[PDB]
């Protein structure tokens, strides 16, 4: 198989707050926040998939680097038809989150969380309790959280 050179620096914050530093010691990090809040609603141009949720970095600097990362971040997500997490780009310069993953539904939760424990290790289960869960992802500055 090919091996991706954009693999980014993994770092956990805590049970809900995580960090992808930018590959090759990149001055930025993709956030990641496990939680409940719904920050977001659905509009008529920002809806999204797994396939282009790359576009919720458009008016990003070295946007591409950002969507190799966020490329290795879902693989083995993406490719699947029955992942289908409703996910809306939000507008970065009027402060919003780039992106809001709703993982509401417990197969979708169950697939982020077990990725994630695939990249940073054991954590709590946000999928035992029930109600509404959200990731919710940003791009945050690097200040050396590790
Ligand atoms: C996790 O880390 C974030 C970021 O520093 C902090 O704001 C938050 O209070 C922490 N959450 C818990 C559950 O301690
Ligand atoms: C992603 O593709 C879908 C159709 O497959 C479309 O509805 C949506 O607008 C696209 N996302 C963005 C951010 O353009
Ligand atoms: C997330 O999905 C659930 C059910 O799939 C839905 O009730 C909820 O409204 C969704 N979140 C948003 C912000 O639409």
Redesign the pocket.
Do not use: G, P
């Given at each position: 198989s090919y091996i991706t050179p954009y693999v980014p620096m993994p770092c956990m914050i805590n049970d809900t707050h995580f960090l992808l530093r930018g590959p090759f010691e990149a001055s930025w990090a993709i956030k990641l926040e496990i939680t409940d809040v719904?920050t977001?609603?659905?509009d008529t141009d920002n809806v999204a998939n797994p396939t282009n949720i790359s576009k919720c970095f458009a008016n990003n600097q070295d946007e591409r680097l950002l969507g190799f990362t966020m490329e290795w971040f879902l693989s083995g997500l993406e490719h699947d038809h029955h992942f289908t997490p409703?996910i809306?780009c939000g507008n970065v310069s009027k402060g919003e989150v780039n992106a809001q993953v709703?993982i509401?539904?417990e197969d979708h939760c169950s697939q982020v969380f077990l990725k994630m424990r695939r990249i940073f290790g054991v954590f709590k289960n946000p999928c035992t309790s029930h109600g509404?869960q959200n990731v919710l992802i940003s791009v945050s500055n690097w200040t050396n959280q590790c």
């Open positions: 719904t977001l609603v659905v409703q809306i709703n509401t539904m509404k």
